[model samples]
Target: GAMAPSYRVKRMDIAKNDEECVVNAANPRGLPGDGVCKAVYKKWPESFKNSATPVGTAKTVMCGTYPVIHAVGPNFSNYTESEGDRELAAAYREVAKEVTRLGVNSVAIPLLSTGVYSGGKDRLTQSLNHLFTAMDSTDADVVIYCRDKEWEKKISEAIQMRT
Candidate 1:
């Protein structure tokens, strides 16, 4: 008997999430520049130095109050649609695994690869699908944080379809 994980969509900043942990959509090299990565970098600068987490993988760094899981998602500009999809899904899976490993009860994650990486709307649905599926294996409550109202609505719609 598999248990379904809790899911919710909220409009908030991942950096300011109250969850036990937060997930950052990071580049393959885990460099921090813009979007969620920049905020996470500013908060935990030392954790990102020399980080080389590859696409479809995740790395965890302790950041005082809670840990941050840097999940490397695909850059759609350089990858085919299929490649991006697979990597995006894998990244979510890795995030789920990290959650289980940390024994955390809750985590907040932003939509990966859709910012500066240029992932399309289709990628948003793809991301939600993989996110829900991967997180089903964990007991942690998952919050999908959206900075934009449009994205929040899209995620709500997608979750409705799935449920």
Candidate 2:
């Protein structure tokens, strides 16, 4: 699909308290509370038969804060791809897909796989472009939440250059 035909682009402060109801990112395999993990601890479904013997995609709820959908990864950092995570290359795709499917008004996303993973300025730019390339530029408004001011500027420039 060419993106849900809705959705716009916006900037978000990753440090914002609750500007985002959900935060999606490429997650690594490890217990929560480690490596500043942003996802909640949970287990995947039984039908999931990819990845390994005990792999699954579970919902993670944030503690000491309002709960929201925190989409994680298949721990691809170590070449271990979960069934639910096998489609991570489609991270942005899934974001656009599910956000619309779920009737969400907005979503906050990280650089996808551009941090502590196979990342590059070129790749990050490409991934983001792919995500918004099909946007209606009207309905859906996506927030590329960044942790630093520099990153925000970069994304802003990318947006201006593309549009």
Candidate 3:
């Protein structure tokens, strides 16, 4: 049937070394099932809360498209300039903010802070834990992609850590 494509949407992407999730948020023109795809649109100078479309966000999401947000503009200046907000605690809110409003049934998370963000191992693991736990709290299906076993182990550990 034309409704579902013959080719399968990649449910996961792996890495050579132990890595959690892909480093996305740069590429745009995303497809269905892509949770962390990079977006083509330039960034907007606003707070990265609620993935805000401030003057009222687009109420309806178009099909075959994924929503893109820069932590605060594409240059990602906030990467270095950022303070408490961009930290792990806020990461959950970021994901939660997007998943709920986008009516997304799933999320494709890349280790949260292992890449450019390069947060600490404990922090990175904690961030992943918080993100997954938040999704669980929201009842949304999240697909995390890690290139290696370490990531898998850490996430598994976090999940089994008795909340």
Candidate 4:
């Protein structure tokens, strides 16, 4: 049989989705700043402040009863393809653990290290490979969220091949 869509990839606007709760990004300080986390920070300052000093790449915080995975990879200046892979793994590793811990069956995550920390297309393949490896055993359904159709296409291919 083909791979189960348990690991689903979709092109949609996460901010507009009402069916599933979303996971936003965060810096190591547990603050949502530039890039993916900025809107999250602007929307929920108090929740972020209450849980300051986040200890790792992944931390969970509640925003009005929804759970957001605050995944902050190393800063862009210090990024490498290998490091990006590792950091992404770090974040997804936590996501898997947290999904089980929170008793939820699904979580949506944008591709990490994109935009400013993109590391370009070649490196993106590394990031996706690492992400899939990390989440392969996760019991919860994982959705790879993408706003760009190009990104969606490439990542969907990776998911199908599971490279």
Candidate 5:
């Protein structure tokens, strides 16, 4: 499964992956909760409102038919270890499916629950691990994109170990 092009990780800009769709991890409220996606919403508030309105979770809304995929990831709090892992895995699995179904060849995925929603560093790490594992057999050309140097280092190391 560690073939030349089946799957891999990359450290780069999620929004500008040369036509690779940006996976925007939105909250259940249909809002771009935090992180890189939040910055996107900040710039395209009206576009987000019009194209990606809060419809529901486990769903994706293309921002004004843009290449962005608004993945409604769970916003967890007081989340147990098992519960958090399961939720994150499910989210990524669904994201893989959505991207494939949309005919998108590549996607830039971020750690769904981190930083602001991570609750703590340990929890954030756990969440990241779950996401990495879930994308093992993902069909799309998945780029594990992150702006944080620390996160990028850790994620890159984990990807090497897995591969």
Candidate 6:
């Protein structure tokens, strides 16, 4: 089998990551609300065109430095468990595809749907599982950025378990 792509967890802001591309956990309406999305907006406000992207899909917009992939993850508050799982998986899958399509050498991604979207522990685990799986299909170096110490440890452990 082909070797798995490099996966690393870092405690930092996604916007500050020097990777070739950064994935934003965006809303369907493409609004740059609080959390990671807001941070991204603050960096490249012009990139957000206020367009609507459907859940489980991604849109690529050119920022001055690099392209940002706005991935719309599920709103767990509004979705059933199975639906949330599928949408989360799809969001990660779409990001991987976008990375591959863009031919970027590296990308940084945050835990989608885990913030204001209200993804609990169950969704956190699912996010890691789905993210790792989706990233395996790409060749780019992947960094999962977590600002929270607890989440950073959880993500680190998850990466260890996969190895």
Highest TM-score scorer? 6
TM-score of 2: 0.55
Better of 4 and 5 by lDDT: 4
Candidate 1 local Cα displacement, residue 34, angstroms: 0.7
Q: Please write out the lDDT profile of model 2 over residues 1-163, one tens digit for every residue.
A: 2244323334443435233335434242333322213332332122122211112222334433333434443343554434323444445444455556555455555654455443223345644564464333424455565555676677777767756
Candidate 1 regions off by >4 Å? 1-5, 119-122, 161-163
Tens-digit lDDT string for candidate 1 (1-163): 1145678899977777878888988877767779889988887776675566888899998766578898998888888989888988899888988899898888888888878886444467667778887887788878889887888998988777767
lDDT of 5: 0.61
Q: In model 4, where do residues sit more than 4 Å from their true spots?
A: 1-5, 18-20, 42-46, 51-56, 79-84, 119-122
User: How many residue pairs collide in each prediction?
Assistant: 0, 5, 8, 0, 0, 0
Ranking the candidates on TM-score from highest down gives 6, 1, 4, 5, 2, 3
lDDT, candidate 3, residue 54?
19
User: What TM-scores do the predictions have?
Assistant: 0.88, 0.55, 0.49, 0.77, 0.74, 0.92
Model 3 per-residue lDDT tens digits across residues 1-163: 1222111112244222122112233211222112233221222212122333211111123223544322211212234424422444455555556556666544455555444434323344555654555555554455565555666776666555744
Off by over 4 Å in 5: 1-13, 43-57, 123-125
The candidate with the higher lDDT, 3 or 5, is 5
lDDT of 4 at 105: 64
Model 4 C-alpha lDDT per residue in residues 7-56, reported as the tens digit of each score: 77778755544424456656676645676567666655655754443322
Q: How much is the lDDT of residue 94 in candidate 4? A: 70
User: Compared with the true structure, what per-residue lDDT tens digits does model 5 show for residues 54-159?
Assistant: 3222455455565566665444565665666667777776766667677766666777777555665445467566665665555566777676677777777776
Error of 3 at 10 (Å): 11
Q: How accurate is candidate 6 locally (lDDT)?
A: 0.85
In model 1, the worst 10-residue window by lDDT is 118-127
Error of 3 at 149 (Å): 1.6
Reference-based lDDT, residue 146, model 2: 56
Cα RMSD for candidate 5? 3.7
